[PDB]
């Protein structure tokens, strides 16, 4: 046998990290997966699925070796470009990203489920306008298993957060993509506001048949002095 008996001992909640060392503060919570906006994890975290990301064109030279490595470590999923709708992020036209998705994501479709580029919640032409332009140019020749989407906004705009997620699920369903991952969400405001935001959205996300996975933004903000903040505690316990 390749394993000892102790290896045989919602599932949606994720750990979006910069410093791998801060994941430890989340020990024993309901976390199934992690990602780091990088193609490589920066170390090893037992018992959680690391999902490599192709962040953008700066990543293209090493991606085949990165993807092969994360699949070999047990990854069932890969994520494409980060906020190509945003100039300060991947900064890619829908046309450019459709060609790049076919070249760099499609080849792994037999060995992993593939996640769309992740769009901001910007107004068209950003956000879900960008995703529509990308799905137009893809024209059925992009192999996409799930849409990846982001929402940052005032903590008191929970209804807008729910509208955005619902519109993302409907867009995916129109194009033959059956689920979304909300790979970043941030309700902006002081700690009490951020905790109240999590108390309304986490159960709604957990109940939403359209949402396969999500990650609050983000681990490194939820930890201080090696300890979960009141916001990190809410993210673990709700």
mmCIF file of C-alpha atoms in Angstrom:
data_model
loop_
_atom_site.group_PDB
_atom_site.id
_atom_site.type_symbol
_atom_site.label_atom_id
_atom_site.label_comp_id
_atom_site.label_asym_id
_atom_site.label_seq_id
_atom_site.Cartn_x
_atom_site.Cartn_y
_atom_site.Cartn_z
ATOM 1 C CA UNK A 1 0.000 0.000 0.000
ATOM 2 C CA UNK A 2 1.053 3.626 -0.778
ATOM 3 C CA UNK A 3 -0.619 5.021 2.472
ATOM 4 C CA UNK A 4 -1.088 4.110 6.222
ATOM 5 C CA UNK A 5 -4.603 3.694 7.823
ATOM 6 C CA UNK A 6 -4.422 7.354 9.258
ATOM 7 C CA UNK A 7 -4.479 8.757 5.616
ATOM 8 C CA UNK A 8 -8.031 7.163 5.354
ATOM 9 C CA UNK A 9 -9.265 9.819 7.892
ATOM 10 C CA UNK A 10 -20.347 22.353 2.254
ATOM 11 C CA UNK A 11 -16.874 21.685 0.868
ATOM 12 C CA UNK A 12 -17.116 25.023 -1.118
ATOM 13 C CA UNK A 13 -14.968 27.329 1.129
ATOM 14 C CA UNK A 14 -11.415 28.265 -0.059
ATOM 15 C CA UNK A 15 -8.176 29.846 1.213
ATOM 16 C CA UNK A 16 -6.833 32.555 -1.119
ATOM 17 C CA UNK A 17 -3.284 33.283 0.188
ATOM 18 C CA UNK A 18 0.003 35.156 -0.431
ATOM 19 C CA UNK A 19 1.925 33.789 2.638
ATOM 20 C CA UNK A 20 1.428 29.967 2.774
ATOM 21 C CA UNK A 21 2.516 30.054 6.488
ATOM 22 C CA UNK A 22 -0.829 31.859 7.421
ATOM 23 C CA UNK A 23 -3.029 28.904 6.245
ATOM 24 C CA UNK A 24 -2.175 27.143 9.638
ATOM 25 C CA UNK A 25 -4.381 29.699 11.521
ATOM 26 C CA UNK A 26 -7.319 28.134 9.492
ATOM 27 C CA UNK A 27 -6.634 24.469 10.734
ATOM 28 C CA UNK A 28 -9.802 22.437 11.396
ATOM 29 C CA UNK A 29 -12.227 24.772 9.530
ATOM 30 C CA UNK A 30 -14.410 23.719 6.545
ATOM 31 C CA UNK A 31 -11.764 24.488 3.829
ATOM 32 C CA UNK A 32 -11.395 22.178 0.785
ATOM 33 C CA UNK A 33 -9.152 24.124 -1.611
ATOM 34 C CA UNK A 34 -6.541 26.966 -1.820
ATOM 35 C CA UNK A 35 -5.021 29.223 -4.535
ATOM 36 C CA UNK A 36 -2.373 32.077 -4.472
ATOM 37 C CA UNK A 37 -2.714 33.943 -7.822
ATOM 38 C CA UNK A 38 0.450 31.961 -8.800
ATOM 39 C CA UNK A 39 1.078 28.770 -10.845
ATOM 40 C CA UNK A 40 3.056 27.202 -7.943
ATOM 41 C CA UNK A 41 1.976 26.839 -4.276
ATOM 42 C CA UNK A 42 5.177 28.116 -2.560
ATOM 43 C CA UNK A 43 5.251 25.021 -0.300
ATOM 44 C CA UNK A 44 3.006 22.064 0.726
ATOM 45 C CA UNK A 45 -0.342 22.161 2.650
ATOM 46 C CA UNK A 46 -1.708 18.686 3.616
ATOM 47 C CA UNK A 47 -5.389 17.813 3.251
ATOM 48 C CA UNK A 48 -6.418 20.698 0.856
ATOM 49 C CA UNK A 49 -6.516 20.934 -2.990
ATOM 50 C CA UNK A 50 -4.103 23.532 -4.410
ATOM 51 C CA UNK A 51 -5.465 25.005 -7.710
ATOM 52 C CA UNK A 52 -2.702 26.420 -9.987
ATOM 53 C CA UNK A 53 -3.417 29.708 -11.826
ATOM 54 C CA UNK A 54 -2.261 30.987 -15.168
ATOM 55 C CA UNK A 55 -2.315 34.673 -14.027
ATOM 56 C CA UNK A 56 -1.638 36.160 -17.451
ATOM 57 C CA UNK A 57 0.938 36.431 -20.269
ATOM 58 C CA UNK A 58 3.849 36.849 -17.806
ATOM 59 C CA UNK A 59 3.106 33.127 -16.864
ATOM 60 C CA UNK A 60 3.060 31.563 -20.435
ATOM 61 C CA UNK A 61 6.675 30.245 -20.661
ATOM 62 C CA UNK A 62 6.504 28.056 -17.507
ATOM 63 C CA UNK A 63 2.740 27.114 -17.659
ATOM 64 C CA UNK A 64 3.041 23.599 -19.187
ATOM 65 C CA UNK A 65 5.519 22.539 -16.469
ATOM 66 C CA UNK A 66 3.422 24.356 -13.754
ATOM 67 C CA UNK A 67 0.123 22.703 -14.878
ATOM 68 C CA UNK A 68 1.750 19.206 -15.164
ATOM 69 C CA UNK A 69 3.221 19.649 -11.646
ATOM 70 C CA UNK A 70 -0.085 20.728 -9.959
ATOM 71 C CA UNK A 71 -2.034 17.870 -11.711
ATOM 72 C CA UNK A 72 0.685 15.372 -10.441
ATOM 73 C CA UNK A 73 0.229 16.749 -6.888
ATOM 74 C CA UNK A 74 -3.514 15.823 -7.273
ATOM 75 C CA UNK A 75 -5.087 19.150 -8.640
ATOM 76 C CA UNK A 76 -8.402 18.312 -10.438
ATOM 77 C CA UNK A 77 -8.703 22.001 -11.538
ATOM 78 C CA UNK A 78 -6.779 24.893 -13.153
ATOM 79 C CA UNK A 79 -7.700 28.630 -13.217
ATOM 80 C CA UNK A 80 -7.047 31.093 -16.118
ATOM 81 C CA UNK A 81 -6.178 34.850 -16.113
ATOM 82 C CA UNK A 82 -6.705 37.213 -13.190
ATOM 83 C CA UNK A 83 -8.854 40.302 -13.905
ATOM 84 C CA UNK A 84 -7.934 40.645 -17.600
ATOM 85 C CA UNK A 85 -10.701 43.382 -17.583
ATOM 86 C CA UNK A 86 -8.475 45.526 -15.192
ATOM 87 C CA UNK A 87 -5.412 47.470 -16.505
ATOM 88 C CA UNK A 88 -3.475 47.034 -13.190
ATOM 89 C CA UNK A 89 -4.056 43.204 -13.412
ATOM 90 C CA UNK A 90 -3.774 40.778 -16.390
ATOM 91 C CA UNK A 91 -4.949 43.637 -18.757
ATOM 92 C CA UNK A 92 -6.042 41.451 -21.832
ATOM 93 C CA UNK A 93 -8.714 42.120 -24.515
ATOM 94 C CA UNK A 94 -11.505 39.469 -24.851
ATOM 95 C CA UNK A 95 -10.060 38.543 -28.266
ATOM 96 C CA UNK A 96 -6.463 38.130 -26.978
ATOM 97 C CA UNK A 97 -7.672 36.066 -23.945
ATOM 98 C CA UNK A 98 -9.840 33.700 -26.157
ATOM 99 C CA UNK A 99 -6.754 32.890 -28.325
ATOM 100 C CA UNK A 100 -4.573 32.458 -25.185
ATOM 101 C CA UNK A 101 -7.215 30.251 -23.412
ATOM 102 C CA UNK A 102 -7.336 27.881 -26.441
ATOM 103 C CA UNK A 103 -3.489 27.651 -26.575
ATOM 104 C CA UNK A 104 -2.708 27.255 -22.831
ATOM 105 C CA UNK A 105 -5.889 25.975 -21.042
ATOM 106 C CA UNK A 106 -7.651 23.714 -23.621
ATOM 107 C CA UNK A 107 -4.683 21.216 -23.868
ATOM 108 C CA UNK A 108 -5.263 20.099 -20.198
ATOM 109 C CA UNK A 109 -9.050 19.492 -20.537
ATOM 110 C CA UNK A 110 -8.682 15.600 -20.458
ATOM 111 C CA UNK A 111 -6.678 15.849 -17.114
ATOM 112 C CA UNK A 112 -8.356 18.810 -15.295
ATOM 113 C CA UNK A 113 -11.479 20.928 -15.108
ATOM 114 C CA UNK A 114 -10.724 24.402 -16.505
ATOM 115 C CA UNK A 115 -11.838 27.755 -14.948
ATOM 116 C CA UNK A 116 -12.521 30.873 -17.089
ATOM 117 C CA UNK A 117 -10.493 34.032 -16.595
ATOM 118 C CA UNK A 118 -11.761 35.738 -13.394
ATOM 119 C CA UNK A 119 -13.437 39.169 -14.111
ATOM 120 C CA UNK A 120 -13.926 42.071 -11.566
ATOM 121 C CA UNK A 121 -17.400 43.351 -10.754
ATOM 122 C CA UNK A 122 -16.711 46.451 -12.900
ATOM 123 C CA UNK A 123 -19.482 47.845 -15.138
ATOM 124 C CA UNK A 124 -19.309 46.996 -18.870
ATOM 125 C CA UNK A 125 -17.016 47.015 -20.675
ATOM 126 C CA UNK A 126 -15.373 45.438 -17.524
ATOM 127 C CA UNK A 127 -16.630 42.552 -15.420
ATOM 128 C CA UNK A 128 -19.438 40.417 -16.863
ATOM 129 C CA UNK A 129 -19.388 42.581 -20.070
ATOM 130 C CA UNK A 130 -15.768 41.425 -20.572
ATOM 131 C CA UNK A 131 -16.870 37.771 -19.898
ATOM 132 C CA UNK A 132 -19.622 38.117 -22.582
ATOM 133 C CA UNK A 133 -16.976 39.446 -25.112
ATOM 134 C CA UNK A 134 -14.666 36.554 -24.171
ATOM 135 C CA UNK A 135 -17.426 33.889 -24.578
ATOM 136 C CA UNK A 136 -18.333 35.596 -27.980
ATOM 137 C CA UNK A 137 -14.707 35.288 -29.288
ATOM 138 C CA UNK A 138 -14.302 31.756 -27.789
ATOM 139 C CA UNK A 139 -17.344 30.860 -30.035
ATOM 140 C CA UNK A 140 -17.640 27.378 -28.478
ATOM 141 C CA UNK A 141 -13.961 26.449 -28.994
ATOM 142 C CA UNK A 142 -12.909 27.288 -25.387
ATOM 143 C CA UNK A 143 -13.115 24.202 -23.024
ATOM 144 C CA UNK A 144 -14.555 25.828 -19.853
ATOM 145 C CA UNK A 145 -15.938 23.765 -16.946
ATOM 146 C CA UNK A 146 -16.742 26.779 -14.615
ATOM 147 C CA UNK A 147 -16.767 30.633 -14.686
ATOM 148 C CA UNK A 148 -14.478 32.405 -12.168
ATOM 149 C CA UNK A 149 -15.775 35.816 -10.920
ATOM 150 C CA UNK A 150 -14.815 38.516 -8.327
ATOM 151 C CA UNK A 151 -16.879 40.946 -6.252
ATOM 152 C CA UNK A 152 -15.500 43.880 -4.159
ATOM 153 C CA UNK A 153 -17.915 46.436 -2.822
ATOM 154 C CA UNK A 154 -19.366 48.220 0.236
ATOM 155 C CA UNK A 155 -20.410 45.681 2.904
ATOM 156 C CA UNK A 156 -23.947 47.217 2.859
ATOM 157 C CA UNK A 157 -24.402 46.255 -0.877
ATOM 158 C CA UNK A 158 -25.184 42.549 -0.193
ATOM 159 C CA UNK A 159 -28.142 42.622 -2.710
ATOM 160 C CA UNK A 160 -25.710 43.764 -5.464
ATOM 161 C CA UNK A 161 -23.311 40.915 -4.533
ATOM 162 C CA UNK A 162 -26.291 38.422 -4.912
ATOM 163 C CA UNK A 163 -27.403 40.021 -8.235
ATOM 164 C CA UNK A 164 -23.853 39.730 -9.633
ATOM 165 C CA UNK A 165 -23.407 36.026 -8.617
ATOM 166 C CA UNK A 166 -26.902 35.153 -10.013
ATOM 167 C CA UNK A 167 -26.065 36.935 -13.355
ATOM 168 C CA UNK A 168 -22.724 35.054 -13.500
ATOM 169 C CA UNK A 169 -24.599 31.619 -13.060
ATOM 170 C CA UNK A 170 -27.142 32.581 -15.755
ATOM 171 C CA UNK A 171 -24.332 33.700 -18.219
ATOM 172 C CA UNK A 172 -22.455 30.396 -17.702
ATOM 173 C CA UNK A 173 -25.731 28.369 -18.262
ATOM 174 C CA UNK A 174 -26.384 30.324 -21.529
ATOM 175 C CA UNK A 175 -22.955 29.143 -22.854
ATOM 176 C CA UNK A 176 -22.970 25.492 -21.624
ATOM 177 C CA UNK A 177 -20.967 26.130 -18.334
ATOM 178 C CA UNK A 178 -22.900 24.716 -15.410
ATOM 179 C CA UNK A 179 -21.277 26.334 -12.236
ATOM 180 C CA UNK A 180 -19.305 29.444 -11.015
ATOM 181 C CA UNK A 181 -16.441 29.887 -8.547
ATOM 182 C CA UNK A 182 -16.471 33.263 -6.671
ATOM 183 C CA UNK A 183 -12.659 33.218 -6.336
ATOM 184 C CA UNK A 184 -12.616 36.621 -4.555
ATOM 185 C CA UNK A 185 -15.267 38.502 -2.610
ATOM 186 C CA UNK A 186 -14.711 41.440 -0.262
ATOM 187 C CA UNK A 187 -17.416 43.319 1.694
ATOM 188 C CA UNK A 188 -15.528 46.612 2.456
ATOM 189 C CA UNK A 189 -15.853 48.390 5.856
ATOM 190 C CA UNK A 190 -14.751 48.123 9.506
ATOM 191 C CA UNK A 191 -14.637 44.721 11.284
ATOM 192 C CA UNK A 192 -18.283 44.754 12.535
ATOM 193 C CA UNK A 193 -19.464 45.477 8.952
ATOM 194 C CA UNK A 194 -17.242 42.777 7.427
ATOM 195 C CA UNK A 195 -18.532 40.149 9.970
ATOM 196 C CA UNK A 196 -22.213 41.109 9.336
ATOM 197 C CA UNK A 197 -21.488 40.769 5.548
ATOM 198 C CA UNK A 198 -20.143 37.165 6.021
ATOM 199 C CA UNK A 199 -23.166 36.255 8.224
ATOM 200 C CA UNK A 200 -25.551 37.062 5.276
ATOM 201 C CA UNK A 201 -23.445 35.807 2.285
ATOM 202 C CA UNK A 202 -21.777 32.544 3.511
ATOM 203 C CA UNK A 203 -25.076 30.631 4.015
ATOM 204 C CA UNK A 204 -26.525 32.052 0.754
ATOM 205 C CA UNK A 205 -23.359 30.833 -1.092
ATOM 206 C CA UNK A 206 -23.459 27.416 0.677
ATOM 207 C CA UNK A 207 -27.197 26.998 -0.416
ATOM 208 C CA UNK A 208 -26.650 28.266 -4.003
ATOM 209 C CA UNK A 209 -26.699 25.213 -6.358
ATOM 210 C CA UNK A 210 -25.023 27.475 -9.025
ATOM 211 C CA UNK A 211 -21.864 28.206 -6.850
ATOM 212 C CA UNK A 212 -19.494 25.140 -6.759
ATOM 213 C CA UNK A 213 -16.661 26.973 -4.791
ATOM 214 C CA UNK A 214 -15.807 30.411 -3.282
ATOM 215 C CA UNK A 215 -12.942 32.231 -1.441
ATOM 216 C CA UNK A 216 -13.278 35.409 0.710
ATOM 217 C CA UNK A 217 -10.550 38.083 0.005
ATOM 218 C CA UNK A 218 -8.290 37.002 1.555
ATOM 219 C CA UNK A 219 -6.275 34.850 4.067
ATOM 220 C CA UNK A 220 -3.468 37.390 4.765
ATOM 221 C CA UNK A 221 -6.035 40.119 5.767
ATOM 222 C CA UNK A 222 -7.971 37.678 8.043
ATOM 223 C CA UNK A 223 -4.874 36.866 10.231
ATOM 224 C CA UNK A 224 -2.887 39.203 12.663
ATOM 225 C CA UNK A 225 -0.180 38.222 15.236
ATOM 226 C CA UNK A 226 -0.535 34.568 13.981
ATOM 227 C CA UNK A 227 -4.229 34.712 15.048
ATOM 228 C CA UNK A 228 -7.602 34.921 13.172
ATOM 229 C CA UNK A 229 -9.150 38.439 13.383
ATOM 230 C CA UNK A 230 -12.864 38.678 14.297
ATOM 231 C CA UNK A 231 -13.408 38.537 10.474
ATOM 232 C CA UNK A 232 -11.187 35.369 10.053
ATOM 233 C CA UNK A 233 -13.090 33.743 12.962
ATOM 234 C CA UNK A 234 -16.416 34.459 11.189
ATOM 235 C CA UNK A 235 -15.027 33.001 7.942
ATOM 236 C CA UNK A 236 -14.087 29.758 9.816
ATOM 237 C CA UNK A 237 -17.224 29.258 12.041
ATOM 238 C CA UNK A 238 -20.311 30.406 10.024
#
